[PDB]
Homo-oligomer: A and B are copies of this chain.
């Protein structure tokens, strides 16, 4: 059972060899197993993965359709056993008012997760609704604290950050990896130029605290291996990419559909 330090050494080794760190979301055990088979560097499981693999939108994991934290424990039964040599992280809902994080994080460690991520995250929420949440005890600060406690438990931490300010707070928390989240994936949101600017801004910020933080990109217009490649070319300090919808949903969806059509096409002589 590798330590956090060993995992961070594993990654920084690949980074020095010019190899990207790719993390993936798994919503089913088959997803997890297939991602391991493609030599994925780390796998994360959250409620959104389930909902995604149910054919629903990713943002379904942020709303009142189920308890995120209880769903992730339930999903562990499906996923952990079929993954044999790849670290699996738990998406933790850090603002859960009915969870004691310290206890829950220990529980996740004993279940077998290598680490955690803050997901669902209020960082995806904007507007006056976001402001009210921050004002009434459902703030990103609480996610930051959750990451800090996880770090103190020697769990790997790969938190989503949406700004330099977030990048700092999570650096100071002891985050091993920062996933710069650009927004929901797939001309609605951020330009590719905006992503470049923000990601570089977060890199410079992160580094004010610590020069050896690993920084990966996720979301908005970064939708496919070529988009991920453009970020690696554009942002020097960025060394990889986290994908969930890109990794498991769209591929499966295409393949199942193509296969169905193929059977449907056969005719008798």
Contacts and interface: CB of A to CB of B under 8 A. Distances in A.
B67 A266 contact: no
A97 B74 CA distance: 13
A265 B178 CA distance: 21
Give the interface centre of A47, A63, A226 by most chain B CB atoms within 10 Å: A63
A34 interface: yes
A255 B99 CA distance: 27
Nearest to A243: B263
B29 A267 contact: no
A140 to B, nearest CB: 13
Interface string A66-104: 111000000011111110000000000101111110010
Contact of A65 (B38, B55, B68, B136): B68
Interface residues of A, number: 106
- Interface class of chain A by DSSP: helix
Contacts of A38: 256-261, 263-264
Interface string A168-189: 0000000000000001100011
Contact of A66 (B22, B64, B228): B64
Contacts of A82: 54-56, 97
B184 A249 contact: no
A269 B20 CA distance: 12
Contacts of A19: 264, 267
A225 B54 contact: no
B98 A65 contact: yes
Indicate the member of A130, A184, A225, A264 with the most B CB atoms within 10 Å.
Answer: A264
A60 interface: yes
A267 B225 CA distance: 10
Sorted from nearest, which 6 A-B pairs have the closest CB atoms?
A: A38-B260, A127-B127, A57-B136, A29-B54, A34-B256, A251-B255
29 contacts: A24-B260, A29-B55, A34-B253, A34-B254, A35-B257, A38-B260, A39-B261, A40-B260, A41-B264, A54-B78, A56-B98, A58-B136, A59-B138, A62-B63, A62-B64, A64-B68, A65-B68, A66-B67, A77-B99, A80-B100, A81-B98, A103-B112, A127-B127, A225-B263, A232-B268, A246-B263, A247-B260, A248-B256, A250-B259
Interface of A: 18-20, 22, 24, 28-35, 37-41, 47, 51-68, 76-82, 93, 95-100, 103, 110-112, 120, 124-133, 135-138, 183-184, 188-189, 225-226, 228-229, 232-233, 241, 243, 246-269
